[PDB]
Ligand SMILES: Cc1cc2nc3c(=O)[nH]c(=O)nc-3n(C[C@H](O)[C@H](O)[C@H](O)COP(=O)(O)OP(=O)(O)OC[C@H]3O[C@@H](n4cnc5c(N)ncnc54)[C@H](O)[C@@H]3O)c2cc1C
Ligand SMILES: Cc1cc2nc3c(=O)[nH]c(=O)nc-3n(C[C@H](O)[C@H](O)[C@H](O)COP(=O)(O)OP(=O)(O)OC[C@H]3O[C@@H](n4cnc5c(N)ncnc54)[C@H](O)[C@@H]3O)c2cc1C
Ligand code: HEM
Ligand code: HEM
Ligand code: NI
């Protein structure tokens with residue numbers, strides 16, 4: 566269920582490392598079953614304490630399926646680089662990946678406002694304090710859902726090593742190494758309907774460097 | 780509509796992003812794994828250990844859903860309701876076919892050349908033992924069995940919010956190769972190979 570089979574010295578049980586990954590990557594891929602068939606869809610998520618939270622239209626069939634109790638598996642992955650070995654067999658990727666399992670719970674109408682504010686502040690930190698409150702109609706058009714991050718329902722796999730070359734290939738010489746991969750925020754692009762010379766909000770001024778989820 | 784039907788655009792995404800997430804069903808319940816993939820013409824190809832339980836399930840006929848996503852930006856609107864991510868995502872459905880022993884060498888070389896272009900012509904051939912330890916699987920990309928969602932919009936704010944002012948826009952995200960890191964057991968002054976020197980700028984088509 567939660568135990569890695571292959572290269573299981575890459576499995577980590579640190580919850581702290583888990584949070585670090587979940588607070589870095591804003592995209593999750595969610596898998597569920599419909600009529601015996603698998604389905605998978607990407608979606609933004611934020612970790613709000615010990616819950617993974619998503620949201621979307623109350624009219625999405627996918628989100629409705631989860632709201633109705635479809636058991637789910639949630640995958641979150643950071644691709645950190647390419648492992649260039651002296652053979653193709655030992656070539657690889659550096660990455661960090663988490664997989665979480667359970668049933669999403671529907672956030673109650675009374676709680677949606679608070680979870681959505683916290684979700685927004687994952688995606689664009691400090692943004693909630695800059696915006697107007699959501700309207701009752703906006704909230705009624707939104708389904709928010711939360712999956713519990715417990716002790717037993719998650720697995721973390723970490724690969725950040727170097728090529729592991731056969732001694733034969735070493736002897737032959739040749740270059741080996743890692744080409745890193747990073748995901749970075751670009752300079753912001755102002756929308757055409759924004760008044761000329763309007764400043765960047767502080768929250769957006771923060772969206773610089775390598776992509777994070779807090 | 781944000782659903783695209785262009786096979787050319789699908790290929791463009793599959794030739795950009797090397798990570799897939801594969802969903803399948805074990806015991807009426809869902810499982811999801813990340814894996815590297817390459818597009819080899821009209822097949823999406825993955826590989827790993829003959830001893831991996833989940834690759835074995837695929838090999839055994841388990842129907843799959845394969846998701847490939849590129850995150851392109853943060854859509855920052857005047858309201859949190861209208862804020863979102865710019866992204867491209869494909870989902871492909873079907874059953875992976877096991878690649879035959881006689882065919883694996885060719886497919887794995889093609890796969891290598893997706894992940895590190897030009898690299899196979901630089902390396903020695905894989906050994907029989909290496910091949911034998913490897914399971915390679917291919918999912919057909921047909922006319923029917925996929926969908927492509929492309930959201931590359933600007934924020935669409937209500938009139939009342941535009942009139943109230945405030946900034947809005949898009950903060951792009953890009954994924955870039957960094958400077959190579961030479962492994963500890965390589966001699967100082969061994970030059971970078973041509974394949975590696977070609978790996979600069981964006982994770983790119
Ligand atoms: C960016 C990236 C690229 C990858 N490319 C490849 C590839 O090209 N070939 C390949 O074989 N593998 C690749 N993997 C790893 C792949 O996800 C599996 O770890 C691998 O196939 C071995 O799985 P298994 O047989 O051990 O899992 P199984 O024994 O079938 O699964 C048992 C349990 O292990 C845990 N687990 C397994 N893998 C992961 C994971 N990756 N993250 C979190 N939890 C996990 C889960 O809880 C799971 O239910 C890649 C991973 C990442 C992040
Ligand atoms: C980076 C990223 C972040 C996202 N964040 C959010 C979010 O925060 N909230 C939210 O509601 N949605 C988000 N989405 C979109 C999500 O994938 C769905 O499009 C959305 O939940 C509505 O799905 P649906 O119920 O209309 O599709 P359904 O009607 O349930 O599915 C029908 C079929 O349409 C096709 N399809 C649907 N979506 C996609 C896709 N994305 N890629 C390829 N094929 C597809 C599939 O074949 C699917 O089986 C995000 C997508 C990306 C890539
Ligand atoms: C050239 C680029 C290649 C890349 C980027 C690549 C990447 C990977 C990755 C990411 C893994 C998963 C390791 C893990 O679980 O953490 C893996 C496993 C594996 N790859 Fe590759 N690979 C490549 C080429 C090859 C080739 C050519 C073969 C065979 C000839 C091969 C055989 C295997 C095998 C057998 C495993 C299973 C590892 C194990 O569980 O012991 N790979 N590969
Ligand atoms: C603040 C950061 C937020 C981000 C990054 C975000 C992101 C997204 C994304 C990516 C989508 C998918 C659009 C698509 O289908 O292509 C979406 C849909 C949606 N979001 Fe958000 N969102 C945010 C805040 C909010 C809030 C606070 C609400 C409600 C109060 C809201 C309500 C919705 C609704 C209803 C949809 C479905 C749109 C539709 O299909 O009609 N969002 N969001
Ligand atoms: Ni609030």
Ligand code: NI
Pocket residue numbers: 884885886888
């Ligand atoms: Ni060949």
